[PDB]
Protein backbone atom coordinates (compact mmCIF):
# COMPACT_ATOMS: atom_id res chain seq x y z
CA UNK A 1 0.00 0.00 0.00
CA UNK A 2 1.80 3.08 -1.30
CA UNK A 3 1.28 6.63 -0.07
CA UNK A 4 -0.73 8.90 -2.36
CA UNK A 5 1.26 10.01 -5.41
CA UNK A 6 3.72 7.13 -5.16
CA UNK A 7 3.79 4.54 -7.95
CA UNK A 8 6.22 2.09 -6.32
CA UNK A 9 7.26 1.73 -2.69
CA UNK A 10 9.15 -0.54 -0.34
CA UNK A 11 8.38 -1.40 3.25
CA UNK A 12 11.57 0.24 4.52
CA UNK A 13 12.73 2.85 1.97
CA UNK A 14 9.46 4.68 1.38
CA UNK A 15 8.75 5.73 -2.19
CA UNK A 16 10.97 4.34 -4.95
CA UNK A 17 9.25 6.13 -7.83
CA UNK A 18 6.71 8.95 -7.72
CA UNK A 19 3.99 9.93 -10.16
CA UNK A 20 5.80 11.79 -12.97
CA UNK A 21 4.03 15.05 -12.05
CA UNK A 22 5.26 14.89 -8.44
CA UNK A 23 8.78 15.40 -7.05
CA UNK A 24 10.62 12.77 -5.03
CA UNK A 25 12.44 13.84 -1.87
CA UNK A 26 14.83 11.66 0.11
CA UNK A 27 14.68 12.06 3.88
CA UNK A 28 17.39 10.55 6.08
CA UNK A 29 17.15 11.71 9.69
CA UNK A 30 17.52 8.17 10.30
CA UNK A 31 18.91 4.72 9.89
CA UNK A 32 18.44 5.00 6.13
CA UNK A 33 16.84 7.02 3.30
CA UNK A 34 13.06 7.31 3.00
CA UNK A 35 11.55 8.53 -0.24
CA UNK A 36 8.53 10.79 -0.18
CA UNK A 37 6.40 12.42 -2.92
CA UNK A 38 5.69 16.16 -3.18
CA UNK A 39 3.91 18.50 -5.62
CA UNK A 40 6.60 21.09 -4.86
CA UNK A 41 9.75 20.95 -2.75
CA UNK A 42 10.04 22.46 0.75
CA UNK A 43 12.38 25.35 1.57
CA UNK A 44 16.00 24.20 1.75
CA UNK A 45 15.40 22.31 -1.49
CA UNK A 46 14.74 23.32 -5.09
CA UNK A 47 12.34 21.74 -7.64
CA UNK A 48 14.55 19.96 -10.20
CA UNK A 49 12.81 18.80 -13.36
CA UNK A 50 15.46 16.30 -14.45
CA UNK A 51 15.34 13.96 -17.44
CA UNK A 52 15.12 10.78 -15.29
CA UNK A 53 12.36 12.24 -13.02
CA UNK A 54 11.33 15.32 -11.00
CA UNK A 55 13.55 15.61 -7.87
CA UNK A 56 13.82 17.76 -4.73
CA UNK A 57 17.53 18.57 -4.61
CA UNK A 58 19.00 19.84 -1.35
CA UNK A 59 20.53 23.34 -1.16
CA UNK A 60 24.19 22.98 -0.28
CA UNK A 61 25.06 26.68 -0.24
CA UNK A 62 27.02 27.86 2.78
CA UNK A 63 24.69 29.70 5.17
CA UNK A 64 21.64 29.44 2.89
CA UNK A 65 18.07 28.77 4.01
CA UNK A 66 16.34 28.61 0.61
CA UNK A 67 17.68 28.58 -2.92
CA UNK A 68 16.79 29.06 -6.58
CA UNK A 69 19.38 26.57 -7.84
CA UNK A 70 22.51 24.76 -6.68
CA UNK A 71 24.56 27.97 -6.67
CA UNK A 72 22.05 30.75 -6.15
CA UNK A 73 20.48 31.53 -2.76
CA UNK A 74 17.14 33.30 -2.31
CA UNK A 75 17.23 33.53 1.48
CA UNK A 76 20.20 33.43 3.87
CA UNK A 77 20.13 32.27 7.49
CA UNK A 78 19.02 35.05 9.85
CA UNK A 79 21.60 37.79 10.34
CA UNK A 80 23.58 36.97 7.22
CA UNK A 81 24.22 39.25 4.26
CA UNK A 82 22.77 38.22 0.92
CA UNK A 83 24.83 39.29 -2.07
CA UNK A 84 24.29 38.00 -5.61
CA UNK A 85 22.88 34.63 -4.47
CA UNK A 86 25.53 34.03 -1.86
CA UNK A 87 25.52 34.48 1.93
CA UNK A 88 28.24 36.36 3.81
CA UNK A 89 29.25 37.14 7.40
CA UNK A 90 28.94 40.93 7.20
Amino acid sequence: ACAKGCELCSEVNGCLKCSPKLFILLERNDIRQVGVCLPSCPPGYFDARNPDMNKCIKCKIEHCEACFSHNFCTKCKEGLYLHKGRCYPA
Binding site: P39, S40, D47, R49, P51, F68, S69, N71, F72, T74, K84, G85
Partner: protein
Protein backbone atom coordinates in the same frame (compact mmCIF):
# COMPACT_ATOMS: atom_id res chain seq x y z
CA UNK B 1 -1.23 25.35 19.48
CA UNK B 2 -2.36 29.02 19.07
CA UNK B 3 -6.14 29.55 18.64
CA UNK B 4 -6.78 30.00 14.94
CA UNK B 5 -9.73 30.34 12.54
CA UNK B 6 -10.62 26.91 11.14
CA UNK B 7 -9.37 25.09 9.10
CA UNK B 8 -6.10 26.99 9.30
CA UNK B 9 -3.27 26.66 11.78
CA UNK B 10 -1.22 29.58 13.09
CA UNK B 11 2.28 29.38 14.58
CA UNK B 12 2.19 32.65 16.47
CA UNK B 13 4.71 35.03 14.87
CA UNK B 14 2.07 35.94 12.23
CA UNK B 15 2.31 32.91 9.90
CA UNK B 16 -0.82 31.10 8.76
CA UNK B 17 -0.89 27.65 7.20
CA UNK B 18 -4.11 26.75 5.39
CA UNK B 19 -2.76 24.42 2.70
CA UNK B 20 -4.44 21.17 1.65
CA UNK B 21 -7.79 22.04 3.15
CA UNK B 22 -10.02 21.99 0.09
CA UNK B 23 -10.66 25.75 0.23
CA UNK B 24 -12.32 27.36 -2.78
CA UNK B 25 -11.86 30.91 -1.50
CA UNK B 26 -9.37 32.88 0.57
CA UNK B 27 -9.98 31.88 4.23
CA UNK B 28 -11.72 34.28 6.59
CA UNK B 29 -11.49 35.04 10.28
CA UNK B 30 -7.72 35.42 10.17
CA UNK B 31 -5.95 38.38 11.78
CA UNK B 32 -5.15 41.31 9.47
CA UNK B 33 -1.74 41.22 11.16
CA UNK B 34 -0.90 38.05 9.24
CA UNK B 35 2.46 38.22 7.49
CA UNK B 36 2.54 34.93 5.62
CA UNK B 37 -0.35 32.95 4.25
CA UNK B 38 0.03 29.47 2.82
CA UNK B 39 -3.07 28.47 0.87
CA UNK B 40 -1.44 26.13 -1.61
CA UNK B 41 -2.91 22.74 -2.55
CA UNK B 42 -6.48 23.93 -2.26
CA UNK B 43 -9.28 24.25 -4.84
CA UNK B 44 -9.29 27.99 -5.55
CA UNK B 45 -10.07 28.28 -9.25
CA UNK B 46 -10.73 32.02 -9.15
CA UNK B 47 -9.49 35.01 -7.18
CA UNK B 48 -12.16 37.75 -7.02
CA UNK B 49 -11.68 41.51 -6.65
CA UNK B 50 -10.22 42.50 -3.28
CA UNK B 51 -9.73 38.86 -2.30
CA UNK B 52 -6.86 39.96 -0.03
CA UNK B 53 -8.50 43.10 1.37
CA UNK B 54 -7.99 42.07 5.00
CA UNK B 55 -4.39 41.02 4.43
CA UNK B 56 -2.67 44.38 3.85
CA UNK B 57 0.55 43.33 5.54
CA UNK B 58 1.19 40.02 3.80
CA UNK B 59 4.84 39.47 2.87
CA UNK B 60 4.55 35.88 1.63
CA UNK B 61 1.61 34.47 -0.33
CA UNK B 62 1.49 30.86 -1.46
CA UNK B 63 -1.05 29.91 -4.11
CA UNK B 64 0.78 26.98 -5.76
CA UNK B 65 -1.33 23.95 -6.71
CA UNK B 66 -4.85 25.42 -6.76
CA UNK B 67 -5.82 25.00 -10.43
CA UNK B 68 -6.17 28.78 -10.38
CA UNK B 69 -7.40 29.87 -13.81
CA UNK B 70 -8.52 33.42 -13.14
CA UNK B 71 -7.07 36.26 -11.10
CA UNK B 72 -9.18 39.42 -11.05
CA UNK B 73 -7.25 42.55 -12.15
CA UNK B 74 -7.68 43.90 -8.60
CA UNK B 75 -7.46 40.70 -6.56
CA UNK B 76 -3.95 41.53 -5.37
CA UNK B 77 -4.88 45.09 -4.49
CA UNK B 78 -3.19 46.59 -1.46
CA UNK B 79 -0.49 43.97 -1.05
CA UNK B 80 2.23 46.63 -0.86
CA UNK B 81 4.50 44.54 1.38
CA UNK B 82 4.34 41.31 -0.62
CA UNK B 83 7.82 39.95 -1.28
CA UNK B 84 7.05 36.39 -2.32
CA UNK B 85 4.22 35.18 -4.52
CA UNK B 86 3.96 31.55 -5.57
CA UNK B 87 1.59 30.52 -8.35
CA UNK B 88 3.19 27.31 -9.70
CA UNK B 89 1.10 24.27 -10.66
CA UNK B 90 -1.99 26.24 -11.66
CA UNK B 91 -3.94 26.89 -14.88
CA UNK B 92 -2.94 30.46 -15.68
CA UNK B 93 -2.38 30.07 -19.47
CA UNK B 94 -1.10 33.64 -19.78
CA UNK B 95 0.94 35.84 -17.41
CA UNK B 96 -1.57 37.75 -15.21
CA UNK B 97 0.09 41.09 -15.94
CA UNK B 98 -2.72 43.36 -14.84
CA UNK B 99 -3.24 41.63 -11.50
CA UNK B 100 0.43 41.77 -10.44
CA UNK B 101 0.93 45.36 -11.61
CA UNK B 102 0.89 46.99 -8.17
CA UNK B 103 3.07 44.49 -6.28
CA UNK B 104 5.90 47.00 -5.99
CA UNK B 105 7.57 45.13 -3.08
CA UNK B 106 7.67 41.75 -4.88
CA UNK B 107 11.06 39.97 -4.97
CA UNK B 108 10.09 36.43 -5.94
CA UNK B 109 7.45 35.43 -8.50
CA UNK B 110 6.85 31.77 -9.34
CA UNK B 111 4.83 31.25 -12.51
CA UNK B 112 6.22 27.89 -13.52
CA UNK B 113 3.96 25.01 -14.59
CA UNK B 114 0.93 27.00 -15.70
CA UNK B 115 0.44 26.12 -19.37
CA UNK B 116 1.47 29.69 -20.21
CA UNK B 117 1.66 30.25 -23.99
CA UNK B 118 1.83 34.03 -24.11
CA UNK B 119 3.10 36.82 -21.91
CA UNK B 120 1.56 40.27 -22.64
CA UNK B 121 3.92 43.07 -23.58
CA UNK B 122 3.17 45.08 -20.42
CA UNK B 123 3.90 42.18 -18.05
CA UNK B 124 6.12 42.94 -15.04
CA UNK B 125 5.76 46.73 -15.24
CA UNK B 126 5.74 48.00 -11.67
CA UNK B 127 7.78 45.06 -10.37
CA UNK B 128 10.58 47.49 -9.43
CA UNK B 129 12.00 45.10 -6.83
CA UNK B 130 11.85 41.75 -8.59
CA UNK B 131 14.89 39.55 -7.88
CA UNK B 132 13.78 36.05 -8.94
CA UNK B 133 11.46 35.03 -11.76
CA UNK B 134 10.41 31.49 -12.65
CA UNK B 135 8.66 30.92 -15.97
CA UNK B 136 9.82 27.37 -16.51
CA UNK B 137 7.73 24.35 -17.54
CA UNK B 138 5.30 26.33 -19.65
CA UNK B 139 4.79 26.68 -23.40
CA UNK B 140 6.57 29.90 -24.31
CA UNK B 141 7.72 29.95 -27.93
CA UNK B 142 10.03 32.93 -27.56
CA UNK B 143 11.88 35.07 -25.04
CA UNK B 144 9.48 37.78 -23.71
CA UNK B 145 11.79 40.67 -24.49
CA UNK B 146 9.80 43.76 -23.69
CA UNK B 147 8.32 42.33 -20.47
CA UNK B 148 11.85 41.47 -19.25
CA UNK B 149 13.06 45.01 -20.00
CA UNK B 150 10.98 46.06 -16.96
CA UNK B 151 13.23 44.20 -14.55
CA UNK B 152 16.68 45.82 -14.15
CA UNK B 153 16.85 44.54 -10.57
CA UNK B 154 16.38 40.92 -11.68
CA UNK B 155 18.99 38.45 -10.40
CA UNK B 156 17.65 34.99 -11.28
CA UNK B 157 15.64 33.97 -14.31
CA UNK B 158 14.55 30.59 -15.61
CA UNK B 159 12.91 30.15 -19.01
CA UNK B 160 13.75 26.44 -18.93
CA UNK B 161 11.43 23.65 -20.12
CA UNK B 162 9.61 25.76 -22.73
CA UNK B 163 9.49 25.79 -26.56
CA UNK B 164 11.90 28.63 -27.30
CA UNK B 165 13.74 27.96 -30.58
CA UNK B 166 15.78 31.10 -31.24
CA UNK B 167 17.04 34.18 -29.41
CA UNK B 168 17.42 37.57 -31.15
CA UNK B 169 19.96 40.36 -30.57
CA UNK B 170 19.54 42.21 -27.25
CA UNK B 171 16.87 39.86 -25.87
CA UNK B 172 18.02 40.48 -22.27
CA UNK B 173 19.72 43.82 -22.68
CA UNK B 174 18.28 45.50 -19.58
CA UNK B 175 18.87 42.68 -17.11
CA UNK B 176 21.99 44.38 -15.70
CA UNK B 177 21.75 42.59 -12.39
CA UNK B 178 21.07 39.15 -13.83
CA UNK B 179 23.32 36.63 -12.12
CA UNK B 180 21.82 33.32 -13.30
CA UNK B 181 19.90 32.51 -16.47
CA UNK B 182 18.34 29.10 -17.18
CA UNK B 183 17.48 28.27 -20.79
CA UNK B 184 17.78 24.52 -20.55
CA UNK B 185 15.30 22.10 -22.18
CA UNK B 186 14.07 24.35 -24.92
CA UNK B 187 14.49 23.85 -28.64
CA UNK B 188 17.03 26.59 -29.15
CA UNK B 189 18.67 26.10 -32.53
CA UNK B 190 19.81 29.69 -33.00
CA UNK B 191 21.48 32.34 -30.83
CA UNK B 192 22.41 35.55 -32.66
CA UNK B 193 25.75 37.37 -32.24
CA UNK B 194 24.40 39.79 -29.63
CA UNK B 195 21.56 37.96 -27.90
CA UNK B 196 23.35 38.21 -24.53
CA UNK B 197 24.63 41.80 -24.75
CA UNK B 198 24.01 43.64 -21.47
CA UNK B 199 24.28 40.65 -19.13
CA UNK B 200 27.54 42.01 -17.68
CA UNK B 201 26.82 40.55 -14.25
CA UNK B 202 25.81 37.08 -15.42
CA UNK B 203 27.68 34.25 -13.64
CA UNK B 204 25.70 31.16 -14.65
CA UNK B 205 24.34 30.36 -18.10
CA UNK B 206 22.52 27.08 -18.55
CA UNK B 207 21.91 26.12 -22.16
CA UNK B 208 21.76 22.32 -21.65
CA UNK B 209 19.31 20.19 -23.70
CA UNK B 210 18.74 22.32 -26.76
CA UNK B 211 19.56 21.97 -30.44
CA UNK B 212 22.57 24.24 -30.84
CA UNK B 213 24.51 23.08 -33.89
CA UNK B 214 27.30 25.63 -33.64
CA UNK B 215 29.18 27.13 -30.71
CA UNK B 216 27.55 30.45 -29.69
CA UNK B 217 29.77 33.50 -30.30
CA UNK B 218 27.26 35.46 -28.18
CA UNK B 219 28.79 34.32 -24.86
CA UNK B 220 31.69 36.64 -25.70
CA UNK B 221 29.51 39.34 -24.12
CA UNK B 222 29.48 37.72 -20.67
CA UNK B 223 32.54 38.99 -18.79
CA UNK B 224 31.27 37.72 -15.42
CA UNK B 225 30.60 34.10 -16.45
CA UNK B 226 31.77 31.47 -13.98
CA UNK B 227 29.61 28.51 -14.91
CA UNK B 228 28.58 27.46 -18.42
CA UNK B 229 26.49 24.48 -19.50
CA UNK B 230 25.77 23.40 -23.07
CA UNK B 231 25.65 19.64 -22.62
CA UNK B 232 23.21 17.59 -24.69
CA UNK B 233 23.21 19.77 -27.74
CA UNK B 234 24.45 19.21 -31.27
CA UNK B 235 27.71 21.15 -31.25
CA UNK B 236 30.55 19.57 -33.24
CA UNK B 237 33.29 22.21 -32.96
CA UNK B 238 34.58 24.33 -30.08
CA UNK B 239 36.67 26.84 -32.02
CA UNK B 240 39.70 28.98 -31.21
CA UNK B 241 38.55 32.04 -29.27
CA UNK B 242 35.37 30.41 -27.95
CA UNK B 243 35.89 31.70 -24.39
CA UNK B 244 37.88 34.90 -24.99
CA UNK B 245 35.01 36.78 -23.39
CA UNK B 246 34.94 34.73 -20.20
CA UNK B 247 38.23 34.83 -18.24
CA UNK B 248 36.43 33.92 -15.06
CA UNK B 249 35.04 30.56 -16.26
CA UNK B 250 35.38 27.91 -13.53
CA UNK B 251 33.07 25.29 -14.97
CA UNK B 252 32.19 24.20 -18.49
CA UNK B 253 29.75 21.37 -19.22
CA UNK B 254 30.23 20.24 -22.81
CA UNK B 255 29.49 16.51 -22.74
CA UNK B 256 26.87 14.69 -24.83
CA UNK B 257 27.71 16.69 -27.89
CA UNK B 258 28.77 15.18 -31.25
CA UNK B 259 31.98 17.01 -30.50
CA UNK B 260 34.62 16.04 -33.01
CA UNK B 261 37.00 18.98 -33.17
CA UNK B 262 38.39 21.59 -30.80
CA UNK B 263 40.62 24.52 -31.72
CA UNK B 264 44.15 24.29 -30.34
CA UNK B 265 43.77 27.46 -28.25
CA UNK B 266 40.09 27.10 -27.35
CA UNK B 267 40.95 26.51 -23.68
CA UNK B 268 43.89 28.82 -23.09
CA UNK B 269 43.64 31.85 -20.76
CA UNK B 270 41.25 30.27 -18.29
CA UNK B 271 43.03 30.76 -15.00
CA UNK B 272 40.04 29.56 -12.93
CA UNK B 273 39.07 26.42 -14.95
CA UNK B 274 39.23 23.46 -12.59
CA UNK B 275 38.41 20.65 -14.95
CA UNK B 276 38.70 19.98 -18.64
CA UNK B 277 37.15 16.75 -19.82
CA UNK B 278 36.82 16.12 -23.54
CA UNK B 279 36.01 12.67 -24.90
CA UNK B 280 35.67 11.57 -28.49
CA UNK B 281 36.96 14.65 -30.29
CA UNK B 282 38.26 12.34 -32.98
CA UNK B 283 39.67 15.03 -35.23
CA UNK B 284 41.98 16.64 -32.66
CA UNK B 285 45.63 16.00 -33.67
CA UNK B 286 47.56 18.26 -31.29
CA UNK B 287 47.53 18.43 -27.49
CA UNK B 288 45.60 21.59 -26.51
CA UNK B 289 47.40 24.82 -25.71
CA UNK B 290 46.85 25.36 -21.98
CA UNK B 291 48.91 28.43 -21.25
CA UNK B 292 47.16 30.59 -18.68
CA UNK B 293 45.05 27.52 -17.82
CA UNK B 294 47.20 25.95 -15.11
CA UNK B 295 44.84 25.17 -12.24
CA UNK B 296 43.18 22.12 -13.73
CA UNK B 297 42.46 19.47 -11.12
CA UNK B 298 41.45 17.01 -13.81
CA UNK B 299 42.51 16.70 -17.42
CA UNK B 300 40.90 14.15 -19.69
CA UNK B 301 41.51 13.94 -23.42
CA UNK B 302 40.22 10.77 -24.99
CA UNK B 303 39.53 9.35 -28.45
CA UNK B 304 41.77 11.73 -30.39
CA UNK B 305 44.67 11.53 -32.84
CA UNK B 306 47.03 13.14 -30.32
CA UNK B 307 50.42 11.39 -30.37
CA UNK B 308 52.52 13.60 -28.13
CA UNK B 309 52.28 15.19 -24.65
CA UNK B 310 54.11 18.50 -24.23
CA UNK B 311 57.07 18.55 -21.81
CA UNK B 312 55.64 21.53 -19.98
CA UNK B 313 52.41 19.80 -18.88
CA UNK B 314 53.93 18.93 -15.53
CA UNK B 315 56.04 22.06 -15.13
CA UNK B 316 52.95 24.22 -15.48
CA UNK B 317 49.94 22.42 -13.99
CA UNK B 318 49.85 23.32 -10.31
CA UNK B 319 47.23 21.06 -8.79
CA UNK B 320 46.67 18.29 -11.32
CA UNK B 321 45.18 15.32 -9.45
CA UNK B 322 43.86 13.16 -12.27
CA UNK B 323 45.16 12.76 -15.81
CA UNK B 324 43.40 10.63 -18.39
CA UNK B 325 44.98 10.53 -21.86
CA UNK B 326 43.69 7.09 -22.76
CA UNK B 327 42.63 5.98 -26.21
CA UNK B 328 44.83 8.26 -28.30
CA UNK B 329 47.95 7.64 -30.38
CA UNK B 330 50.59 8.54 -27.82
CA UNK B 331 53.97 6.88 -28.36
CA UNK B 332 56.57 8.74 -26.27
CA UNK B 333 56.09 9.99 -22.72
CA UNK B 334 57.50 13.20 -21.24
CA UNK B 335 58.52 13.32 -17.59
CA UNK B 336 55.75 13.53 -15.06
CA UNK B 337 58.13 14.94 -12.47
CA UNK B 338 56.55 18.17 -11.30
CA UNK B 339 53.04 16.73 -11.08
CA UNK B 340 53.30 16.27 -7.31
CA UNK B 341 49.53 16.24 -6.71
CA UNK B 342 48.97 13.65 -9.41
CA UNK B 343 47.04 10.65 -8.08
CA UNK B 344 45.50 8.87 -11.06
CA UNK B 345 47.15 8.44 -14.45
CA UNK B 346 45.38 6.71 -17.30
CA UNK B 347 47.32 5.95 -20.46
CA UNK B 348 45.44 2.88 -21.76
CA UNK B 349 44.99 2.25 -25.43
CA UNK B 350 47.92 4.19 -26.86
CA UNK B 351 51.16 3.15 -28.60
CA UNK B 352 53.64 3.40 -25.72
CA UNK B 353 56.50 0.94 -26.27
CA UNK B 354 58.79 1.65 -23.31
CA UNK B 355 58.90 3.05 -19.79
CA UNK B 356 62.16 4.75 -18.89
CA UNK B 357 63.46 5.30 -15.37
CA UNK B 358 62.58 8.98 -15.24
CA UNK B 359 59.08 8.68 -16.70
CA UNK B 360 57.38 8.44 -13.29
CA UNK B 361 60.00 9.78 -10.85
CA UNK B 362 58.30 12.70 -9.14
CA UNK B 363 54.94 11.04 -8.49
CA UNK B 364 54.64 10.91 -4.70
CA UNK B 365 50.85 10.98 -4.65
CA UNK B 366 50.46 8.38 -7.43
CA UNK B 367 47.90 5.77 -6.40
CA UNK B 368 46.56 4.54 -9.72
CA UNK B 369 48.48 4.03 -12.96
CA UNK B 370 46.87 2.36 -15.98
CA UNK B 371 49.18 1.47 -18.89
CA UNK B 372 47.22 -1.44 -20.28
CA UNK B 373 46.68 -1.97 -24.00
CA UNK B 374 49.88 -0.43 -25.27
CA UNK B 375 52.98 -1.93 -26.94
CA UNK B 376 55.34 -1.87 -23.98
CA UNK B 377 58.23 -4.28 -24.39
CA UNK B 378 60.66 -2.78 -21.87
CA UNK B 379 60.20 -1.25 -18.43
CA UNK B 380 63.32 0.02 -16.72
CA UNK B 381 64.20 -1.92 -13.56
CA UNK B 382 63.95 1.22 -11.40
CA UNK B 383 60.92 2.67 -13.19
CA UNK B 384 58.79 2.59 -10.05
CA UNK B 385 61.52 2.92 -7.42
CA UNK B 386 60.77 6.52 -6.49
CA UNK B 387 57.01 6.07 -6.10
CA UNK B 388 54.72 6.92 -3.23
CA UNK B 389 51.56 5.07 -2.19
CA UNK B 390 51.18 3.23 -5.52
CA UNK B 391 48.15 1.07 -4.97
CA UNK B 392 46.98 -0.03 -8.36
CA UNK B 393 49.10 -0.88 -11.39
CA UNK B 394 47.70 -2.16 -14.67
CA UNK B 395 50.16 -3.13 -17.38
CA UNK B 396 48.00 -5.81 -18.96
CA UNK B 397 47.95 -6.54 -22.72
CA UNK B 398 51.37 -5.19 -23.49
CA UNK B 399 54.52 -6.90 -24.73
CA UNK B 400 56.45 -7.57 -21.52
CA UNK B 401 58.95 -10.41 -21.15
CA UNK B 402 59.86 -9.37 -17.63
CA UNK B 403 58.48 -7.10 -14.95
CA UNK B 404 60.22 -5.02 -12.28
CA UNK B 405 59.31 -5.34 -8.61
CA UNK B 406 61.14 -2.41 -7.04
CA UNK B 407 58.79 0.10 -5.40
CA UNK B 408 55.73 -2.06 -5.90
CA UNK B 409 55.38 -3.90 -2.59
CA UNK B 410 52.49 -1.69 -1.58
CA UNK B 411 50.36 -2.74 -4.54
CA UNK B 412 46.85 -3.96 -3.77
CA UNK B 413 46.08 -4.55 -7.41
CA UNK B 414 48.34 -5.73 -10.23
CA UNK B 415 47.22 -6.67 -13.72
CA UNK B 416 49.69 -8.55 -15.93
CA UNK B 417 47.36 -10.64 -18.07
CA UNK B 418 47.84 -10.47 -21.85
CA UNK B 419 51.62 -10.39 -21.77
CA UNK B 420 51.99 -13.66 -23.60
CA UNK B 421 55.76 -13.80 -23.47
CA UNK B 422 55.86 -12.95 -19.78
CA UNK B 423 57.52 -16.00 -18.29
CA UNK B 424 58.53 -15.02 -14.77
CA UNK B 425 56.31 -15.81 -11.80
CA UNK B 426 55.99 -13.36 -8.92
CA UNK B 427 57.12 -14.13 -5.40
CA UNK B 428 54.49 -13.52 -2.71
CA UNK B 429 57.14 -11.83 -0.54
CA UNK B 430 57.65 -8.92 -2.96
CA UNK B 431 53.89 -8.29 -2.82
CA UNK B 432 52.60 -8.77 0.70
CA UNK B 433 49.74 -6.30 0.17
CA UNK B 434 48.46 -7.92 -3.01
CA UNK B 435 44.76 -8.76 -2.96
CA UNK B 436 43.99 -8.93 -6.66
CA UNK B 437 46.38 -10.24 -9.34
CA UNK B 438 45.99 -11.16 -12.98
CA UNK B 439 48.73 -13.06 -14.83
CA UNK B 440 48.98 -14.56 -18.33
CA UNK B 441 49.29 -18.22 -17.27
CA UNK B 442 47.85 -20.49 -14.61
CA UNK B 443 51.23 -21.64 -13.30
CA UNK B 444 51.90 -18.01 -12.36
CA UNK B 445 49.20 -18.21 -9.64
CA UNK B 446 50.81 -21.17 -7.86
CA UNK B 447 52.57 -18.89 -5.38
CA UNK B 448 49.24 -17.44 -4.37
CA UNK B 449 47.44 -20.83 -4.42
CA UNK B 450 48.57 -24.22 -3.13
CA UNK B 451 50.04 -25.64 -6.34
CA UNK B 452 43.91 -12.75 -2.65
CA UNK B 453 42.25 -13.44 -6.00
CA UNK B 454 44.96 -14.46 -8.47
CA UNK B 455 43.52 -15.23 -11.90
CA UNK B 456 45.03 -16.21 -15.32
CA UNK B 457 41.62 -15.69 -17.00
CA UNK B 458 41.96 -13.34 -19.97
CA UNK B 459 38.54 -12.00 -18.95
CA UNK B 460 37.67 -12.81 -22.57
CA UNK B 461 39.77 -9.84 -23.81
Amino acid sequence: PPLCAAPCSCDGDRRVDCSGKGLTAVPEGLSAFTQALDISMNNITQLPEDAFKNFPFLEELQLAGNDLSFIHPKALSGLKELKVLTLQNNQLKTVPSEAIRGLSALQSLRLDANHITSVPEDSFEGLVQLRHLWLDDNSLTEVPVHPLSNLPTLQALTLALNKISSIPDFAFTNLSSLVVLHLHNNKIRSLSQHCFDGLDNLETLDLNYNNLGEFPQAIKALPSLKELGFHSNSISVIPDGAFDGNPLLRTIHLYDNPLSFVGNSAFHNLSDLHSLVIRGASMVQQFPNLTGTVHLESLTLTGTKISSIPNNLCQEQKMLRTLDLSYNNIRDLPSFNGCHALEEISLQRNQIYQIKEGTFQGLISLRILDLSRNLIHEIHSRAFATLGPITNLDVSFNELTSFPTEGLNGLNQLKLVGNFKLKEALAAKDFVNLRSLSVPYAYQCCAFWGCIHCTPSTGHH
